[PDB]
Amino acid sequence: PVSVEELDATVRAFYEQQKAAQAALNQFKEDPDAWLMVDEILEQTKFLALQVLDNVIMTRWKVLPREQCQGIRNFVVQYILQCSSSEESLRTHRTLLNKLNLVLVSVLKQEWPHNWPTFINEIVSACHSSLSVCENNMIILRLLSEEVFDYSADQMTSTKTRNLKSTMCAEFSMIFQLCQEILNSATQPSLIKATLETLLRFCNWIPLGYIFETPLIDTLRTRFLEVPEFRNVTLQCLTEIGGLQTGGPGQPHTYDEQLIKMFTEVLTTISNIIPLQMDLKATYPNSNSRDQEFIQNLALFLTSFFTMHLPLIENLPNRDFLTHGHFYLIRISQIDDREIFKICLDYWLKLVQELYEEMQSLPLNDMSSMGLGMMSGGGAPNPALLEHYPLRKHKYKEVLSNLRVVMIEKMVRPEEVLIVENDEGEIVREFVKDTDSVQLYKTIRECLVYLTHLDVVDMEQIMTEKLARQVDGSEWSWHNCNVLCWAIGSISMAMNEETEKRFLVTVIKDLLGLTEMKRGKDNKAVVASNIMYIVGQYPRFLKAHWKFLKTVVNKLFEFMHESHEGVQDMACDTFIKIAKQCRRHFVALQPSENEPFIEEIIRNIGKITCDLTPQQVHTFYEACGYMVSAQGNRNQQERLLAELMAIPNAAWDEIIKAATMNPGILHEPDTIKIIGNIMKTNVSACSSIGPYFFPQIGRLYNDMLQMYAATSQLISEAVARDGEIATKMPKVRGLRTIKKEILKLVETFVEKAEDLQAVRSQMIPGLLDSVLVDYNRNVPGARDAEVLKAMTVIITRLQGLMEDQVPAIMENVFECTLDMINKDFAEYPEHRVEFFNLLRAINLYCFPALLKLDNRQFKFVIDSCMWASKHDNRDVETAGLNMCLELINNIAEKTDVQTCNAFFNQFFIRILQDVFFVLTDTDHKAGFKTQSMLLMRLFYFVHPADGSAPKIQGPIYQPDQAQPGTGNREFLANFVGTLLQNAFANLTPLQITTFVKDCFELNTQYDKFRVVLRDFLISLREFAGDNAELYQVEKEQQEREARAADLERRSKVGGLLKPSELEDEEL
């Protein structure tokens, strides 16, 4: 319609849902009313119009006529020019103008890369016209820069974008000179700012000649760098230039002199801005957002420049610039801000690790056998023996020494410290946080260590003096104590044993004194937290100093009586830490004592653990378990074990006696709980003591089976009484809990047992007698998946010894469990997953007894396997596909030609078909690794590309009803071909032929096959539309080496691995 009448099709929208919707009804047109619109109407409506305009621009550009797109192009340019060509007009229509600018840049998106050569020229000229059009032209060049530049801005400039900067040589050069012109003359802040912001977005594309050979830098620094308004943006420019890569060592132009002049000068300017006496740590929080951003842009400048050209400033004759630049990085590093400190920390790590690796690569280490240098393993070298070496680390003496103070002060809570001061200052138990807090910790630990190595004397002096201020000279506070102690504990293994001995005696003494001196629940908790952390991180020290070991374990027991759950958690945690690392010192007769320390502990175990929660008690018994394991004297060990388990046994017998008087208490929530705690206590001590737990499991075993039976009887009655609804009631649930807990104990032991024949002879018959038929007779609501789990456990462990039992397990479990799994597509997931796992285990460790299973049942075995293959979860996808792999491989290479015949004859198609549908599916990209391996194996079974004589794995093929035509290689190839053409009908009969040929040829080389199949899949339409997971193998192969080289590096320097990362690395 006309402009005056459709104006209100929206004016009524602001001042009825009726007309509001009507304007939306006029949506699909060709913006014809838009041209007339912008000029005549009303301005809210103009906004609606421009919306329509832009939409049609992107959507309908190539389809629109070459004439009209030219029309709308000139149409927008004229209005940008109408608004921008006046001071006051620029200010009044800034909103409207911006909307337009966006429309122009979106037009530019399709036009400028097409065939608009003189755009830049036109912009530059329009700039010469007036200042206002100029400013808006800068804002347009800036928005345009976000379309062209930003896309290539995150790709780190590769060859693809590198050649772009070469072609657009002139195009960018002009924009430079336009900018240098304005910056040379302009005095309007709006204009200077817009122009500056544009320079930034074009710094990386402007030819290096104009950046360094012109006086651009000189003027950026002198005209704007010290002007508060422009300061941040100019520094961002200087950062981009200082961060520019000088790809020519000396070939095109080594700008070194330009850069040294630049950095040196900018740094002096900064010295005028930021006073020498200003506390950036204290100031920053009270500064405005602009001043804070300045501090961040400075941190970014210095780090960027040093990262890119550190040699230039390091080798300068003056050195004051190297030192003062880094001092700025230090003063900044003290500021309490996550993002800023992250910036600095990354640089710092690079710096310290490099300086260290200079020492590490000396040939002076070749004489380690005489006591010179640093043996690979660990321990910081004496600094004084390195002073007479021309080491870079000497140039940074004063800087590195201050960095140690900072790094300590900026320490973050270790994973081990299970307590935090909250927002309101209360000591609470918050275990861990986001990944970032832990990645931060890893990084800060790394710097702390390298710094310790670079000068262990300086580090020890600083930590020692700080600790003194905590004890006496009062810089005391939870924070300063925490921070210092987290640092101390984190550099563990970075000092040689001797040095560390001195230090630790001081530290542990001072801290042990602090625990008794500081009063109040909270002060006691903080100090305990710190002493626990440290001693837990220094097992090497504790081993060589029995008096210290006994003293800290005793203080641990003390902490276990604290009213703080977090403190208690840390006491048990530290206790098991030490008990595992120093187990042997608890069973031996220490020179000073009358008896082995474990005797004393076990004697008072009841008094020690009386304030502990059950989970803490479990941890306690597990630790004591390690101690017991260290007792090689089998008899002595059995007595130790008996006494340790005294209380749990007593509790157990009490429950058995009670349940004999009336079995009813078994479904009393308290009884269920108690039986649980007892079983868990056993599982804890057993998982630690290992195989020599057999006497304890032997004492309990009979009562355990009878209780399983008794609770089962009770479950029957509750169901017989009130039907299957009872299975989801409190009583039956809890009784089932008793059953599950018992099983978890026997599982724990079976996995530890070494006399596998004794387990098979004495336990297995009783266990199966008690769990199998009971599982079967139960209603679905009451069947325990833990029975499946436990079967998988005993089978995986005893393997062959369990073949004769597999038929009874199958008899009672297979059929009914299947029923639960089948009808219920989303119910009984535990049973579904564990059924699949039980079968897979039977296949892996009891293959012959698996054959005894007949066709009806065999079909379902395959059915389940394929299910797990087609599951959204990654672990179960790998699992199912893999059970298939293991199955077919077993059949082909362990059975008869007639049996394997029958099997492959009965399911080969079934398999390959499913394997194909999952492989060619748009989804399921995760299972490629096994799926490919499946395909290649299948083909090998039919036509193996190997043998000195013509060998094959399968005699005949699919039922005759399928194809009376004899032949495998033929049938296989043909049938596959058909399937292939079904996934994509665009396949030329040569493509389909080539593929199938590769399969028979590459069945020998998994990598060649897998790769060729990967490419063939990438080629097709559907697959290229959702990326490639098929590279899982290439990915893990990379990751493996990564963590392997990293472990390689870390291992070569003391402290980079927590002492708990060496126990496993050795054992």
User: Any idea where the domains of the chain sit in the sequence?
Assistant: 1-1067
∠ at Cα 577 (573, 581), nearest 5°?
Answer: 170
Cα-based distances in Å from 888 to 252, 800, 939, 953 = 64, 20, 12, 11
User: Coil, helix or strand for 987?
Assistant: coil
Q: Pick from 431, 396, 426: which is nearest to 324 by CA?
A: 396
User: Coil, helix or strand for 8?
Assistant: helix
| Residue labelled with tokens 């080629």 | 1019
Instruction: Count Cβ atoms below 10 Å from residue 902 Cβ, excluding itself.
Output: 16
Please give the Cα distance from 610 to 229 (Å, whole number): 67
Q: Pick from 792, 790, 783, 807: which is nearest to 745 by CA?
A: 790
Provide the experimental method for this PDB entry: X-ray
Tell me if 73 sits within 8 A of 107, measured CB to CB.
Answer: yes
User: Coil, helix or strand for 520?
Assistant: coil
Cα-based distances in Å from 820 to 597, 737, 830, 880 = 54, 20, 11, 19
Cα-based distances in Å from 891 to 319, 732, 902 = 75, 43, 10
Please give the Cα distance from 106 to 147 (Å, whole number): 9
Cα-based distances in Å from 1054 to 134, 377, 391, 490, 1059 = 61, 6, 20, 11, 10
User: Coil, helix or strand for 489?
Assistant: helix
Please give the Cα distance from 653 to 647 (Å, whole number): 10
Tell me if 628 sits within 8 A of 606, measured CB to CB.
Answer: no
Tell me if 429 sits within 8 A of 422, measured CB to CB.
Answer: no
Element (H, E) at 711: helix 694-722
Q: Pick from 682, 658, 660, 562: which is nearest to 610 by CA?
A: 562
Encoded tokens for 231: 């300061």
| Cβ within 8 Å of residue 299, ≥6 positions away | 329, 332, 340, 343, 344
Tell me if 47 sits within 8 A of 102, measured CB to CB.
Answer: no
The type of residue at 494 is: A
∠ at Cα 787 (781, 791), nearest 5°?
Answer: 150
Tell me if 826 sits within 8 A of 780, measured CB to CB.
Answer: no
Tell me if 45 sits within 8 A of 11, measured CB to CB.
Answer: yes
User: Coil, helix or strand for 662?
Assistant: coil
Q: Pick from 320, 333, 325: which is nearest to 306 by CA?
A: 325
Q: Is 11 exposed, middle or buried (0-12, 13-18, 19+ CB in 10 A)?
A: middle
User: Coil, helix or strand for 728?
Assistant: helix
**Is the CA virtual torsion 754, 760, 763, 769 positive or negative?**
positive
Element (H, E) at 167: helix 159-167
The backbone region for 458, taken as left when phi is positive above 0, alpha when psi lies in -120 to 50, beta otherwise, is: alpha
Distance of CA 811 to the CA centre of its chain: 44
Tell me if 427 sits within 8 A of 564, measured CB to CB.
Answer: yes
| Cβ within 8 Å of residue 902, ≥6 positions away | none
Phi, psi of 27 (to 5 degrees): -80, -50
Per DSSP, the residues of 997-1032 read HHHHHSSS-HHHHHHHHHHHHHHSTGGGGS---TTH
Please give the Cα distance from 1059 to 500 (Å, whole number): 14
Q: Considering just the CA atoms, what is the radius of gyration of the chain in Å? A: 38
Element (H, E) at 421: strand 420-421
Phi, psi of 923 (to 5 degrees): -95, -160
Tell me the β-bridge partners of 420: 428
Which ranges constitute the DSSP H helices of 494-633? 497-517, 521-536, 539-543, 546-559, 565-581, 584-587, 597-603, 605-608, 614-629
| Cβ within 8 Å of residue 629, ≥6 positions away | 583, 688, 689, 690, 692
User: Coil, helix or strand for 953?
Assistant: coil
| Cβ within 8 Å of residue 354, ≥6 positions away | none
Encoded tokens for 708: 């399983």
Tell me the β-bridge partners of 427: 421
The type of residue at 38 is: V
User: Coil, helix or strand for 1045?
Assistant: helix
User: Resolution in angstroms, to 1 decimal, for this deposition?
Assistant: 2.9
Q: How many residues does the chain have?
A: 1067
Please give the Cα distance from 51 to 1054 (Å, whole number): 63
Q: What's the first-to-final CA gap in the chain, in angstroms?
A: 85
Tell me if 548 sits within 8 A of 508, measured CB to CB.
Answer: yes
Encoded tokens for 635: 């008899």
Please give the Cα distance from 118 to 109 (Å, whole number): 15
Number of C-alpha atoms within 13 angstroms, CB side, residue 515? 17
Pairing relation of β-strands 420-421 and 427-428? antiparallel
Number of C-alpha atoms within 13 angstroms, CB side, residue 900? 18
Tell me if 834 sits within 8 A of 790, measured CB to CB.
Answer: no
Please give the Cα distance from 572 to 314 (Å, whole number): 51
Phi, psi of 978 (to 5 degrees): -55, -50
Instruction: Give the CA-trace dihedral at 205, 209, 211, 215, to 10 degrees.
Output: -150
Please give the Cα distance from 1028 to 500 (Å, whole number): 51
Q: Is 748 exposed, middle or buried (0-12, 13-18, 19+ CB in 10 A)?
A: buried
Please give the Cα distance from 978 to 1000 (Å, whole number): 17
Please give the Cα distance from 527 to 919 (Å, whole number): 59
Phi, psi of 287 (to 5 degrees): -85, 155
